[PDB]
Write a protein that binds this ligand. Structure first.
Ligand SMILES: CCCCCCCCOc1cccc(COc2ccc(Br)cc2P(=O)(O)O)c1
Lengths: 214, 208
C-alpha cells in the first residue's frame, strides 16, 4: 500500500542525542543500534524489499565488527545481509567475516538489508567506471556502447528495486555523499528526529508521506 | 558564503493553471522569474548560478535575445546538457553566445538544456573510456578527482546549495555527482512566484 520497495536511511543524530542527555557519544551509538534493530524489524514486517542504512554522525571497522554480533539474529529473521562500500582495506579477518555473513544469509527470502561500510556515492560510481574501463582495456567493450543502462548495471544494488525513498534523521538537509547515482528519482524525506528516537511511527510517517506524494 | 547555487525551477504549469491561464503564460512568468533570480545572484556576489528548466530547444531560443544584456553585466553564459542533436543553427548560436561571454569575470550562469545528471556522468565515463582504449590511461589510475574533471562545471566552485521550487522533494536527475555535499532546500513556492525574499530565505538556511 505505501508503495515503497526500497528505503535508504542516513542515520544521523546519535552524537546529538547522547549530548542532550549529558552522556558520552558511545551511549548514543548503543541507543542508535537499538533504533536499527527496530527499523529493520519494522521494514521486514511492512513488506519493504530492501533497506539500505548509512551510519553517519554530524571506526567504520568498529561499526562493522559490532554488526558481526547481529548476523545470527538477522539470519533467524530471514534477512539477507549485504555490505556495500570499500571493504578491501579492512582487516583480513573482518573481510572474511563479511564474506561468510553474506554467504550465510544469501538464501534468505525476507528483507534485503544493505549496510554501508566505508561507502561513498562518488566511490560507488568510480568503482563501476573502473569495471567498465577494464572491459574496454580487454577489448570486450566499445567506449561508444557505454550508456546509462550499462553504467547502472555496474553500481551497487543494481539488481535490487530502485531506491524509492531516502530518509535522513538528525535535521541536516544534504546527501553527504551517500547514494548519488541511485537517488536520481528517489523521494527525499528529512526529519529533525534524532536517529535513536526514530521509531515505528516515524517510519510509518515517512512511508505514508511517500505514498501521498508519489 | 554561498558560492554556487543551483535551482530546479519547477511550477510554471501549475502556476498557469492556478492563474486560470494557458501553459504559455506560465512560461512567460517563469522567464521573468529567471531574470529576477539572475539579477539577485549577480547583486549578491554569488559566483555561479545553475538553472534547470523542469516540470528545451525552444527554451534555449528564448534566451538568445538576453545575451547582449548578460554580456554587458559581465555574465559568463554556459549551456550544459546534450545539445548535439539540436538544430545546427541553434547550436551555432549557443556556441557564439558562449564564446562572446567566455572571458567575463562576473557571475557564471549555467543553463541546463536537455541535461541529466546520469547523462553528465556517462559522457564523462565515455571520455575516460576513449582514453583507456588509446592506451592513454590505465583502469586503476581512474579516481574521483579524475572523473570530477570530466563532468560538467569542474572549473567552478562546488555547488553549495540546491533550491527546488514547486513543492516536489526530489532531485529528478538534475545534478548528481556535483551535489554530494550541497545543502538541499525545498520550497512549495511555484517558480514564477519565487522572488528575492524566497532566495534570501534559502541563503539563510545555508548560513545556518
Ligand atoms: C558502539 C557501536 C554500536 C554498535 C552498533 C550495532 C549495530 C546496529 O545493530 C544492528 C545493526 C544492524 C542490524 C541490526 C539488526 O538487529 C536485529 C534485527 C532483527 C532482529 Br529480530 C533482531 C536484531 P537484535 O539481535 O535483537 O538487535 C542491528
Amino acid at each position: 500500500a505505501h508503495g515503497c520497495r526500497h528505503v535508504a536511511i542516513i542515520m544521523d543524530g546519535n552524537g546529538r542525542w547522547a549530548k542532550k542527555q549529558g552522556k558520552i557519544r558511545a551511549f548514543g551509538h548503543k541507543a542508535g543500534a537499538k533504533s536499527v534493530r527496530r527499523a529493520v524489524s519494522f521494514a521486514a514486517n511492512n513488506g519493504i524489499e530492501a533497506l539500505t542504512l548509512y551510519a553517519f554522525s554530524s571506526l567504520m571497522e568498529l561499526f562493522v565488527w559490532a554488526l558481526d554480533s547481529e548476523v545470527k539474529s538477522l539470519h533467524r529473521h530471514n534477512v539477507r545481509l549485504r555490505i556495500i562500500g570499500d571493504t578491501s582495506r579492512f582487516n583480513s579477518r573482518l573481510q572474511e567475516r563479511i564474506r561468510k555473513s553474506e554467504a550465510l544469509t544469501a538464501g534468505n527470502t525476507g528483507l534485503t538489508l544493505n549496510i554501508a561500510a566505508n561507502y561513498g556515492g562518488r566511490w560507488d560510481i568510480v568503482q563501476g567506471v573502473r569495471q567498465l574501463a577494464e572491459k574496454v582495456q580487454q577489448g570486450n567493450l566499445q567506449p561508444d556502447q557505454i550508456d546509462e543502462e550499462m553504467l547502472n548495471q555496474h553500481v551497487c544494488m543494481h539488481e535490487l528495486a530502485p531506491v524509492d525513498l531516502v530518509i535522513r534523521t538528525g535535521g541536516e538537509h544534504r546527501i553527504s555523499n551517500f547514494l548519488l547515482w541511485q537517488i536520481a528519482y528517489a523521494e527525499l524525506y528529512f526529519t529533525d528526529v534524532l536517529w535513536p528516537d526514530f521509531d515505528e511511527q516515524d517510519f510509518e510517517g515517512a512511508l505514508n508521506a511517500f505514498a501521498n506524494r508519489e
